Design a protein around this ligand. Structure first.
Ligand SMILES: *[C@@H]1O[C@H](CO)[C@@H](O[C@@H]2O[C@H](CO)[C@@H](O[C@@H]3O[C@H](CO)[C@@H](O)[C@H](O)[C@@H]3O)[C@H](O)[C@H]2NC(C)=O)[C@H](O)[C@H]1NC(C)=O
Ligand SMILES: *[C@@H]1O[C@H](CO)[C@@H](O[C@@H]2O[C@H](CO)[C@@H](O)[C@H](O)[C@H]2NC(C)=O)[C@H](O)[C@H]1NC(C)=O
Ligand SMILES: *[C@@H]1O[C@H](CO)[C@@H](O[C@@H]2O[C@H](CO)[C@@H](O)[C@H](O)[C@H]2NC(C)=O)[C@H](O)[C@H]1NC(C)=O
Ligand SMILES: *[C@@H]1O[C@H](CO)[C@@H](O[C@@H]2O[C@H](CO)[C@@H](O)[C@H](O)[C@H]2NC(C)=O)[C@H](O)[C@H]1NC(C)=O
Ligand SMILES: *[C@@H]1O[C@H](CO)[C@@H](O)[C@H](O)[C@H]1NC(C)=O
Ligand SMILES: *[C@@H]1O[C@H](CO)[C@@H](O)[C@H](O)[C@H]1NC(C)=O
Ligand SMILES: *[C@@H]1O[C@H](CO)[C@@H](O)[C@H](O)[C@H]1NC(C)=O
Ligand SMILES: *[C@@H]1O[C@H](CO)[C@@H](O)[C@H](O)[C@H]1NC(C)=O
Lengths: 322, 183, 195
């Protein structure tokens, strides 16, 4: 809010401020560019499917156990097991800044249907393979779907069938370690923790800035008009208006830099969801170290979490070749 | 007006314990929000009056001229209490007693009815609410529609194979440059 | 059908339309800014001379030379941000031209929705327009399938395809098109026992 931040609950400060022109009609215009943009990035990552598929009640995918990441009906929200750990690991009287016109708006897509997209992508990538991302969905047995992925890597499909029991147990054990390991180290969520820190810490400096004198007598507007004559009181006030105002245009400039950077990250995430999920990518290390097989998305506060599944060769022996 | 400490707000009672010499209490922003009455020694608490933002919902001027204002981030049981003369900065107070008021997460809406059926978004509001102009015409507010729900029959032994195909053409637009300028 | 789709509405070309809008609108604010007094005696310059002597006019002209300069500074910073955005978009277009035009791209959902065949570029004011040609499967049917087949006490697998049966006889066909074929050793390969 323009006027209240500069001229707190003052009537003689407001009219003097009007002489400075249309300086802060840009701030309403500039900030709304950021506000509209943030409702677009979320819609460009999760809304790539126009059919809300649902998982069948039976969870027997030839031995594989996906119950770890499927939504849980018992929980009041439709959040999976891993998705619940993320919320507890992210922290969002400090809300007294409302009194200085520093409003905060809510996102268009609230958290509840954000997971609904995630459920749709997870359901449609285990019963229809990847064809559902190119038109009509086609069901394929999951136990035999892995054969196509192994063929793409370079190994013949026979290898999968000989070790179906072995491969399922190894994969099932792998996902179990992810649950505890995520909460083991505190720096895992660092790339998300700083986002809520930066967008909250910067507000504190803006509020704390208006307590400085900026070369005037006092930091409060009321006493100046009640102690000094109107003819020269405009000198001290003008020394203070240009102080707070300049400190405000610094804040908006900082927001533009950060906003221009997040967009460069959301677009990369959009490609990751488009390629590493809806298909198999031949690019190296783009969807995780080692040969790529599949990946699953998971929602998170102000971000997304990917779970890549990769193939890695074990011990070897040396031979002689011609 | 407390010994020249001019200001504006609503005064309540607080449990803060001023020491015998203390008279004024400051905050993070270094402004007065706790004063002791000179005559009767009690610890009052000062907070500024209520406020918020205003947004107007409207279709194009070519369509009907009906509107629906919004009050951001305020309990909706407050501004209807302000139904008097010359108490609010907006002067179009005819809509204070408007249509059926509706309460949302981002404030409350005046001039629309919360229908049950859901369509795709037309005018974003917040917290999964988008208004539109449906049919005898009116402004309505409803809930998000994520697309038609569908289920795929999954079985241990079955597969689908296409028996035909189609060819489609899709367009795409990208900016490449902006107007060169100098000053 | 592309002919009228472009001319069917006006919001189809929104991406290019607001690019020039966001630049002309910035100029208008810059032009109208110089009319602001910045709290001084008068906005126009020469008028502030005849109405005062030549000692306190400096504070009355400093405000008219910093505001006219600080505002110009703000406009320049806006241009830098937008230039840093167009630069990111232009590089994407070059990548699209180098892949979706001069060849066939295997990357999914990069040169149009569905499987990609070819694309054609078209010029545009301050932009480029592509025409992606894509292949999309039509209607399908349910089927019954098995992973492997055991004939001489040994298993066989489809070399390139999947086993399928209409309930009476078994066949092997392509992944993306229905073309049943008779089972054939030259069309399969044997590996290991079928137990
Ligand atoms: C599943 O597909 C197979 C392969 O096409 C079907 O078997 C074939 O069906 C055709 C059409 O009925 C048969 O052609 C005709 O068969 C009669 C039988 O008396 C014959 O007199 C005609 O001269 C003509 O050849 C074909 O023989 C038959 N082949 C075999 C090996 O049975 C089968 O009917 C399909 N099952 C379904 C659709 O349920
Ligand atoms: C998938 O794995 C989970 C995790 O181990 C299994 O759930 C466990 O089931 C055992 C007994 O069946 C319980 O003692 C554990 O408390 C369960 N843990 C959790 C986290 O639910 C689940 O049964 C497995 N599903 C399948 C189909 O194998
Ligand atoms: C696959 O779909 C195409 C598209 O409809 C079918 O082509 C049609 O065939 C009928 C009968 O010959 C014609 O009357 C239509 O004019 C054709 N449509 C077009 C767009 O040319 C084709 O027949 C289908 N494939 C099969 C095997 O039926
Ligand atoms: C035949 O194919 C259809 C798919 O085209 C299978 O799915 C049935 O049809 C629609 C698919 O959306 C559903 O309304 C039905 O409920 C589906 N059937 C069942 C039992 O779920 C169908 O299962 C296939 N049938 C056979 C015998 O293979
Ligand atoms: C208003 O709508 C009518 C009917 O759709 C149309 O004929 C007319 O051109 C429109 N006018 C404007 C200014 O859009
Ligand atoms: C206003 O505050 C009361 C206090 O409990 C609350 O019940 C009510 O929901 C609030 N109004 C809105 C619109 O949230
Ligand atoms: C929506 O449906 C419920 C039925 O549970 C009904 O009580 C309610 O009146 C409906 N709302 C509207 C606006 O018709
Ligand atoms: C697939 O069908 C049911 C699904 O519940 C399963 O129990 C059965 O074992 C499977 N069929 C075969 C042949 O494995």
């Amino acid at each position: 809010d323009c006027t209240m931040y500069i001229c707190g609950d003052s009537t003689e400060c407001s009219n003097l401020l009007l002489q400075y022109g249309s300086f802060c009609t840009q701030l309403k215009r500039a900030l709304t560019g950021i506000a509209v943009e943030q409702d677009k990035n979320t819609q460009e990552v999760f809304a790539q499917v126009k059919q809300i598929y649902k998982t069948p009640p039976i969870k027997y995918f030839g031995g594989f156990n996906f119950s770890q990441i499927l939504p849980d009906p018992s929980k009041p929200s439709k959040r999976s097991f891993i998705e619940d750990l993320l919320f507890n690991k992210v922290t969002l009287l400090i809300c007294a800044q409302k009194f200085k016109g520093l409003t905060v708006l809510p996102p268009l897509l609230t958290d509840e249907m954000i997971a609904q997209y995630t459920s749709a992508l997870l359901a449609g990538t285990i019963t229809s393979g990847w064809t559902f991302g190119a038109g009509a969905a086609l069901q394929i047995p999951f136990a035999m779907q892995m054969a196509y992925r192994f063929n793409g890597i370079g190994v013949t499909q026979n290898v999968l069938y000989e070790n179906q029991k072995l491969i399922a147990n190894q994969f099932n054990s792998a996902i179990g370690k992810i649950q505890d390991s995520l909460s083991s180290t505190a720096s895992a969520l660092g790339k998300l923790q700083d986002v809520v820190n930066h967008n909250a810490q910067a507000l504190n400096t803006l509020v704390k800035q208006l307590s400085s004198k900026f070369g005037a007598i006092s930091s409060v507007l009321n006493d100046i008009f009640s102690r000094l004559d109107k003819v020269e009181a405009e000198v001290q006030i003008d020394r203070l208006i240009t102080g707070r105002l300049q400190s405000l245009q610094t804040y908006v400039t900082q927001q533009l830099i950060r906003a221009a950077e997040i967009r460069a990250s959301a677009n990369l995430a959009a490609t990751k969801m488009s390629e590493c999920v809806l298909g198999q990518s031949k690019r190296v290390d783009f969807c995780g170290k080692g040969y790529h097989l599949m990946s699953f998305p998971q929602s998170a506060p102000h971000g997304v979490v990917f779970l890549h599944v990769t193939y890695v060769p074990a011990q070897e022996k040396n031979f002689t070749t011609a | 007006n407390f010994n020249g400490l001019k200001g504006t707000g609503v005064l309540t009672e607080s449990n803060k314990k001023f020491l015998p010499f203390q008279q004024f209490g400051r905050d993070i922003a270094d402004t007065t929000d706790a004063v002791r009455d000179p005559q009767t020694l009690e610890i009052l608490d000062i907070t500024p009056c209520s406020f918020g933002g205003v947004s107007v919902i409207t279709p194009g001027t070519n369509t009907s001229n009906q509107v629906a204002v919004l009050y951001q981030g305020v309990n909706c049981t407050e501004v209807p209490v302000a139904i008097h003369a010359d108490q609010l900065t907006p002067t179009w107070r005819v809509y204070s007693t408007g249509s059926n008021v509706f309460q949302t997460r981002a404030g409350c809406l005046i001039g629309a009815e919360y229908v049950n059926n859901s369509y795709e978004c037309d005018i974003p509001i917040g917290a999964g609410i988008c208004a539109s102009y449906q049919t005898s015409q009116s402004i309505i507010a409803y809930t998000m529609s994520l697309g038609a729900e569908n289920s795929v029959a999954y079985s241990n032994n079955s597969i689908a194979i296409p028996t035909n195909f189609t060819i489609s053409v899709t367009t795409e637009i990208l900016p490449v440059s902006m107007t060169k300028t100098s000053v | 059908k592309i002919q009228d789709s472009l001319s069917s509405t006006a919001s189809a070309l929104g991406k290019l339309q607001d690019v020039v809008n966001h630049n002309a609108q910035a100029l208008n604010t810059l032009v109208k800014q110089l009319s602001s007094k910045f709290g001084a005696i008068s906005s126009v310059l020469n008028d502030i001379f005849s109405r005062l002597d030549k000692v306190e006019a400096e504070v009355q002209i400093d405000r008219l030379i910093t505001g006219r300069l600080q505002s110009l500074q703000t406009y320049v910073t806006q241009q830098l941000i937008r230039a840093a955005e167009i630069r990111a978009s232009a590089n994407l277009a070059a990548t699209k031209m180098s892949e979706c035009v001069l060849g066939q791209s295997k990357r999914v959902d990069f040169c149009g929705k569905g499987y990609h065949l070819m694309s054609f570029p078209q010029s545009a004011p301050h932009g480029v327009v592509f025409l992606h040609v894509t292949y999309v499967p039509a209607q399908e049917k349910n089927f019954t399938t098995a992973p492997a087949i055991c004939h001489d006490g040994k298993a066989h697998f489809p070399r390139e395809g999947v086993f399928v049966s209409n309930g009476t006889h078994w066949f092997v066909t392509q992944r993306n098109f229905y073309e049943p074929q008779i089972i054939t050793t030259d069309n399969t390969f044997v590996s290991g026992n079928c137990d």
